[PDB]
Design an enzyme around this catalytic site. Structure first.
Site, short mmCIF file in Angstrom:
data_model
loop_
_atom_site.label_atom_id
_atom_site.label_comp_id
_atom_site.label_asym_id
_atom_site.label_seq_id
_atom_site.Cartn_x
_atom_site.Cartn_y
_atom_site.Cartn_z
N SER A 186 -19.35 29.94 -25.64
CA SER A 186 -18.06 30.40 -25.14
C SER A 186 -17.91 31.89 -25.36
O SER A 186 -18.42 32.46 -26.32
CB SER A 186 -16.91 29.66 -25.84
OG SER A 186 -15.67 30.28 -25.57
N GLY A 204 -16.88 36.91 -30.29
CA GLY A 204 -16.18 35.82 -29.63
C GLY A 204 -15.36 36.24 -28.43
O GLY A 204 -14.93 35.37 -27.66
N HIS A 229 -3.73 26.33 -28.43
CA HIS A 229 -3.80 27.78 -28.51
C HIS A 229 -3.98 28.35 -27.11
O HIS A 229 -4.29 27.64 -26.16
CB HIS A 229 -4.95 28.23 -29.41
CG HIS A 229 -6.30 28.09 -28.78
ND1 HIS A 229 -6.94 26.88 -28.64
CD2 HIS A 229 -7.13 29.02 -28.24
CE1 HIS A 229 -8.11 27.07 -28.05
NE2 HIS A 229 -8.24 28.35 -27.79
N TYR A 267 -20.86 26.78 -30.64
CA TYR A 267 -20.05 25.69 -31.20
C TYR A 267 -20.91 24.43 -31.30
O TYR A 267 -21.06 23.70 -30.31
CB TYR A 267 -18.81 25.44 -30.36
CG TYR A 267 -17.79 26.56 -30.40
CD1 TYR A 267 -16.81 26.59 -31.39
CD2 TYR A 267 -17.79 27.58 -29.46
CE1 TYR A 267 -15.88 27.60 -31.44
CE2 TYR A 267 -16.86 28.60 -29.50
CZ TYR A 267 -15.90 28.60 -30.49
OH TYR A 267 -14.97 29.61 -30.54
N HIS A 308 -4.68 25.16 -24.24
CA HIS A 308 -5.66 24.09 -24.28
C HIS A 308 -5.89 23.63 -25.72
O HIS A 308 -5.62 24.35 -26.68
CB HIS A 308 -6.99 24.50 -23.64
CG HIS A 308 -7.56 25.78 -24.18
ND1 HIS A 308 -7.08 27.02 -23.83
CD2 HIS A 308 -8.59 26.00 -25.04
CE1 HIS A 308 -7.77 27.95 -24.45
NE2 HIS A 308 -8.69 27.36 -25.19
N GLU A 351 -5.99 32.02 -25.44
CA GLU A 351 -7.00 33.00 -25.82
C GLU A 351 -6.33 34.32 -26.22
O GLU A 351 -5.21 34.63 -25.82
CB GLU A 351 -7.98 33.22 -24.67
CG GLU A 351 -8.72 31.96 -24.27
CD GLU A 351 -9.40 31.28 -25.45
OE1 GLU A 351 -10.30 31.90 -26.05
OE2 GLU A 351 -9.02 30.14 -25.79
C1 9DJ Z 1 -7.82 28.69 -37.54
N1 9DJ Z 1 -8.62 29.57 -36.70
C2 9DJ Z 1 -8.27 30.98 -36.65
C3 9DJ Z 1 -6.97 31.35 -36.32
C4 9DJ Z 1 -6.62 32.69 -36.28
C5 9DJ Z 1 -7.57 33.66 -36.56
C6 9DJ Z 1 -8.87 33.30 -36.88
C7 9DJ Z 1 -9.21 31.96 -36.93
C8 9DJ Z 1 -9.54 28.99 -35.74
C9 9DJ Z 1 -9.93 29.68 -34.58
C10 9DJ Z 1 -10.81 29.10 -33.68
C11 9DJ Z 1 -11.33 27.82 -33.92
C12 9DJ Z 1 -10.94 27.14 -35.08
C13 9DJ Z 1 -10.05 27.72 -35.98
C14 9DJ Z 1 -11.49 25.73 -35.37
C15 9DJ Z 1 -12.54 25.19 -34.46
C16 9DJ Z 1 -12.35 25.65 -33.05
C17 9DJ Z 1 -12.34 27.16 -32.90
C18 9DJ Z 1 -11.97 27.48 -31.47
N2 9DJ Z 1 -12.69 26.58 -30.58
C19 9DJ Z 1 -12.33 26.47 -29.18
C20 9DJ Z 1 -11.34 27.28 -28.65
N3 9DJ Z 1 -11.00 27.19 -27.34
C21 9DJ Z 1 -11.64 26.30 -26.54
C22 9DJ Z 1 -12.64 25.49 -27.06
C23 9DJ Z 1 -12.97 25.59 -28.37
C24 9DJ Z 1 -14.08 24.68 -28.93
O1 9DJ Z 1 -14.01 24.26 -30.11
O2 9DJ Z 1 -15.05 24.36 -28.19
NI NI Z 2 -9.72 28.43 -26.49
#
Ligand code: 9DJ
Ligand code: NI
Length: 343
Positions: free
Chosen positions: A278, A166, A184, A173, A266, A186
């Site tokens: 992504s 990632g 959050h 996605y 974002h 990045e």
């Molecule tokens: C909770 N979590 C977690 C937190 C700490 C460590 C490990 C995982 C976690 C992390 C990531 C995600 C989710 C949950 C739930 C769906 C979404 C993705 C990220 N998706 C995007 C991010 N930026 C931009 C766009 C998108 C998108 O959905 O298109």
């Molecule tokens: Ni993001």
């Protein structure tokens, strides 16, 4: 520089094929215009460029760990949990997304769809096929290939060999209606690039990096406890507009690129069935953003090679600088050129 985008508007770019061949060079251009001041920028590629020829081979692809997004909360303040569910295929996920339980509601416009999102967030828990290690690009794609962008984030793999999924690798996605990614930034305040392969739109809320601290004080006000790095806090735009947090909104459609910038907060949701790809990347300007951030990347190799005059002062903890979120990034430095010649 500065005063390029003083309003911090989310800027949209439509490059020609010649402006599109060099990825790093175009990132420096949009920052010379001030795109980084909004935390988010849309890039519409030319019509000659197509990342994959057809999307009909995808029904048999495995989604290893889909997540059921369970959201709790009230009055525009929410917390979402991600419960892992059984594995499924894309054909199964598409039939589940267009099921009556998960399908996109009837809506007059986006304002109606936005209203129904924040009104029905608690009632049904959607399934999100997120964080799939893989890519949908063809092999011959040489422009804006998310699987191989050739930025200075490659110094991690080229020097220390570390591979982080990632971040060094693309993620997939597959979405359905109401699937949400929480507020959050990045990892290591890195850049991110998101491309919508096909399907229903994906909407984005973005806060300019020069006001990101106002969101962090807001979230601390609601929960007495970098906990937003848990990435599971949802805040309605009603709440942001009440406490004066500046933010803009834009909708990403199938075939459009979105760039998130360092310290650009974002959040958003999917309108229906879609597929997004992504990964994270970096420019020379990010190094100072990663230094102040201390998934944990060691910034040592970036400072030892590209900021060698500041290295020993950084190990001693005496490099205390304040980020200027308005300065555009440089495209090249003498230390970066001599490093590419060493590899
Ligand atoms: C909770 N979590 C977690 C937190 C700490 C460590 C490990 C995982 C976690 C992390 C990531 C995600 C989710 C949950 C739930 C769906 C979404 C993705 C990220 N998706 C995007 C991010 N930026 C931009 C766009 C998108 C998108 O959905 O298109
Ligand atoms: Ni993001």
């Amino acid at each position: 520089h500065g005063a390029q985008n003083p309003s911090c508007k989310i800027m949209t770019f439509r490059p020609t094929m010649e402006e599109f061949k060099d990825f790093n060079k175009y990132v420096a251009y949009i920052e010379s215009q001030g795109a980084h001041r909004a935390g988010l920028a849309k890039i519409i590629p030319p019509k000659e460029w197509k990342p994959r020829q057809t999307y009909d081979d995808i029904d048999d692809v495995v989604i290893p760990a889909p997540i059921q997004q369970v959201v709790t909360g009230q009055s525009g303040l929410f917390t979402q949990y991600n419960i892992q569910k059984k594995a499924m295929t894309v054909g199964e996920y598409r039939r589940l997304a267009n099921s009556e339980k998960y399908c996109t509601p009837r809506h007059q416009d986006f304002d109606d769809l936005e209203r129904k999102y924040w009104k029905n967030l608690t009632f049904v828990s959607p399934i999100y096929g997120a964080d799939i290690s893989g890519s949908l690009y063809d092999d011959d794609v040489a422009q804006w290939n998310i699987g191989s962008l050739r930025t200075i984030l490659d110094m991690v793999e080229r020097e220390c060999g570390t591979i982080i999924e990632g971040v060094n690798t693309p993620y997939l996605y597959f979405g359905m209606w109401k699937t949400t990614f929480a507020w959050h930034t990045e990892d290591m305040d890195l850049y991110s690039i998101n491309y919508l392969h096909f399907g229903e739109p994906k909407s984005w809320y973005a806060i300019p990096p020069e006001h990101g601290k106002r969101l962090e004080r807001l979230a601390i006000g609601f929960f007495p406890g970098a906990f937003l790095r848990h990435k599971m806090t949802l805040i309605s735009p009603i709440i942001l507009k009440k406490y004066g947090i500046p933010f803009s909104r834009i909708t990403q459609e199938a075939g459009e690129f979105m760039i998130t910038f360092p310290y650009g907060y974002h959040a958003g949701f999917n309108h229906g069935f879609n597929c997004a790809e992504s990964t994270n990347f970096a420019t020379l300007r990010w190094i100072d953003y990663g230094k102040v951030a201390t998934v944990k990347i060691s910034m040592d190799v970036f400072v030892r090679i590209l900021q060698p005059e500041r290295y020993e002062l950084w190990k001693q903890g005496k490099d205390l600088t304040v980020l200027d979120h308005t300065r555009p990034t440089a495209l090249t430095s003498p230390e970066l050129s001599s490093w590419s010649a060493s590899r």
